[PDB]
Design a protein around this ligand. Sequence first.
Ligand code: HEC
Ligand code: HEC
Lengths: 130, 130
Amino acid sequence: ADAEHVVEARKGYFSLVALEFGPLAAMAKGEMPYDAAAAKAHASDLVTLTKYDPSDLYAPGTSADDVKGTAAKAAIWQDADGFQAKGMAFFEAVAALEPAAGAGQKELAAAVGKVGGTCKSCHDDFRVKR
Amino acid sequence: ADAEHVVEARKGYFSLVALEFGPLAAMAKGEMPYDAAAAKAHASDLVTLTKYDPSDLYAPGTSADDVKGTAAKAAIWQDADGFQAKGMAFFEAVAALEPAAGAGQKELAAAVGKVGGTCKSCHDDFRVKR
Ligand code: HEC
Ligand code: HEC
């Protein structure tokens, strides 16, 4: 598709991830009361998102070196193996997030912490900083 | 969280739907060669998107009457029954595209036609003509 379109989709993808992770983080932090049903609901939605195959999102020539409006580093394409590894770590942390969701604030907080680490670890090597 | 993030995720969700439907429509139009594997791949991602529960995308007070940058009509919330109806029509049509996607160009075109009808049916009633 056109580069602009791929970029819009890629950012949209992370917008959804952020939308569903947001209330889990809020609850882990104590900003928002713990609600096990709400927690499980967001958690399961996040699992669906990780099931989606994001290949089309990473069309060659759509890095920050190529088009504006994106924060995806060229590194993503030069290190396909490091990228799938950070993706896999995320997918696994999210899987663990499900059972934890309904077992208490302290457990959800622990699980959320692991997921959060995966967000950052990816950003660190593959997202431009500003 | 705030309207602006709900708005970006909703638009993001449709950007992904469009990204995956795009190659299916081009193949059906004869604008790109029929490739059964690729068709199957895009179809299956579309199925995964229809599984994502979109409830959080439709937070009250996020229609075009409320915030700028959205094309979602207040009608979505006024006619929740009819909206759900349009959504299911889309869900079902997408479910029928999967097996057809790799059965041939004519089969794929017919099925993509059905899906296409659902996109526009929902847009006619619930999306601002912008
Ligand atoms: C790598 C495999 C990543 C994982 C795991 C996470 N994110 Fe990330 N993200 C990644 C990239 C390459 C980008 C840039 C996208 C672009 O093209 O610019 C992002 C971006 C985001 C953003 C910004 C979205 C926007 O509107 O522009 C958010 C809010 C975001 N990411 C959040 C996020 C969270 C909450 C994660 C864990 C639950 C997470 N990401 C993981 C790469 C990767
Ligand atoms: C209702 C049940 C819909 C279905 C079925 C389809 N779409 Fe739609 N779409 C709908 C709404 C309410 C909106 C507005 C969202 C907003 O908040 O503005 C949209 C928007 C789009 C867009 C624009 C996305 C953007 O970046 O702003 C596209 C490209 C789009 N929709 C495509 C699309 C396709 C290809 C569909 C069928 C396969 C389809 N949509 C179905 C509502 C509904």
